[PDB]
């Protein structure tokens, strides 16, 4: 192939965990101008790839788009003259016709388990029947079928990971996030991000399969009071939480407003510690070898969204014994003191 589309979906998290797949594609073939037809909140993540070209905004999980927009994007994918598609939109017929209408040599897609994929094989080169209908619920991998097809053994080794999730930040986002946390009470070396706050916003980068992923503030106040301050900078998804956070943990605590995942990764790269709950902050921390702890609502979701915790030797994964994200708030403090210094 020479040009490769990607019709992925989900938002911030699911677009982030596709970076191993795109690096796999660019490792399989020498030169691939990769394009992404994703949803808004997903294009922003594609500042952090250094392997992509266009990254347009479509929201393929709309199912009922404007025919002007639908035909515009169909003709766009046609006029870019792709050779592979690799949807992972998780739909069969209807969307299979949307991939077929694109002049593509190798239409690759995911498929509903239900009857909704009645005729997807008539248009696709690969089937990839899936699980749970909510693929992000599958966890961090989410693409093992797409990966174990991409670069199957035909001449050489697959090499499906390349040191998973090598995100990369630019210097301008680094400078503006540095000015952000310096306008806060933080120094570039000794500070710690948070990125877990009770909110109602899509900028917290949670998931499509996790509901009780974001932790409360009074429980977060007890967590952060249990630990001596290494200047924890708070990462709110919206300014309305700022006056809430100052009302809960105190006026002295410094809050940084980050909604762009590129700005978030620029914050991670300068941070020396991460106390994230199940958001994209955990994976951006595991990228660039930063020390996380990674709270979770269950050991199942913790193993699913962090299977490689035994490979970085810093992300001491934490969960809750019961559900509903009611964790201990005691031993997490102990191994936080262990790992952050």
């Amino acid at each position: 192939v020479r040009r490769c589309c990607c019709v992925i979906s989900g938002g911030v998290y699911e677009n982030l965990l596709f970076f191993p797949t795109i690096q796999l594609i660019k490792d399989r073939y020498p030169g691939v101008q990769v394009d992404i037809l994703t949803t808004e909140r997903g294009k922003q993540t594609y500042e952090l790839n250094k392997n992509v070209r266009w990254a347009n905004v479509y929201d393929p999980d709309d199912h009922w788009p404007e025919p002007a927009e639908y035909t515009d994007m169909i003709g766009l994918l046609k006029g870019r003259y792709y050779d592979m598609v690799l949807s992972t939109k998780l739909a069969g017929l209807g969307h299979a016709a949307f991939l077929f209408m694109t002049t593509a040599r190798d239409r690759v897609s995911y498929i509903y388990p239900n009857v909704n994929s009645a005729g997807a094989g008539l248009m696709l080169s690969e089937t990839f029947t899936a699980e749970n209908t909510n693929l992000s619920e599958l966890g961090y991998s989410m693409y093992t079928q797409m990966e174990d097809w991409l670069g199957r053994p035909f001449r050489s080794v697959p090499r499906t990971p390349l040191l998973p999730l090598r995100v990369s930040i630019s210097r301008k986002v680094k400078e503006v996030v540095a000015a952000k946390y310096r306008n806060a009470g933080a120094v570039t070396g000794k500070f710690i991000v948070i990125h877990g706050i009770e909110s109602d916003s899509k900028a917290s980068m949670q998931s499509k399969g996790d509901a009780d992923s974001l932790l409360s503030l009074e429980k977060w106040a007890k967590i952060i009071k249990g630990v001596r301050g290494f200047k924890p900078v708070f990462v709110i998804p919206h300014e309305k939480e700022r006056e809430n956070v100052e009302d809960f943990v105190g006026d002295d605590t410094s809050i940084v407003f980050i909604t762009t995942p590129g700005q978030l990764a620029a914050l991670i790269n300068d941070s020396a510690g991460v106390i994230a709950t199940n958001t994209a902050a955990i994976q951006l921390a595991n990228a660039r070898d930063k020390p996380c702890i990674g709270l979770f609502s269950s050991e199942e979701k913790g193993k699913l969204f962090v299977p490689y915790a035994e490979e970085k030797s810093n992300c001491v994964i934490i969960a809750s014994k019961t559900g509903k994200l009611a964790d201990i708030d005691i031993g997490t403090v102990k191994n936080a003191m262990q790992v952050f210094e």
């Binding site: 500042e47 790839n49 250094k50 070209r53 347009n56 990369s168 630019s170």
Partner: protein, 93 residues
């Protein structure tokens, strides 16, 4: 021109009724003068210091004069920073 009209209700009316018209030739002449004014302005104000489409605000960022230069620019400068990022990763970040 002057007419007295009787009406039962209110009063008498002293209508005047100056029926006139600009005329066929004068209408052509005002078309002529306005087209000549359009010529004069199209040339002169065309030769004026258009302050917006001269500076580094329009002509700097893109500034071709299209309406897609904004969108293709903010679709290209992501690609340019991504290419520079790949060049940075080519030489060990």
């Amino acid at each position: 021109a002057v007419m007295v009209q009787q009406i039962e209700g209110m009063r008498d009316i002293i209508t005047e009724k100056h029926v006139w018209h600009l005329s066929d030739k004068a209408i052509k002449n005002v078309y002529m003068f306005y087209i000549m004014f359009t010529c004069w302005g199209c040339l002169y104000f065309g030769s004026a210091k258009d302050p917006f489409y001269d500076s580094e605000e329009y002509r700097g960022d893109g500034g071709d004069g299209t309406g897609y230069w904004v969108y293709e620019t903010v679709c290209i400068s992501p690609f340019l920073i991504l290419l520079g990022k790949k060049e940075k990763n080519l030489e060990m970040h």
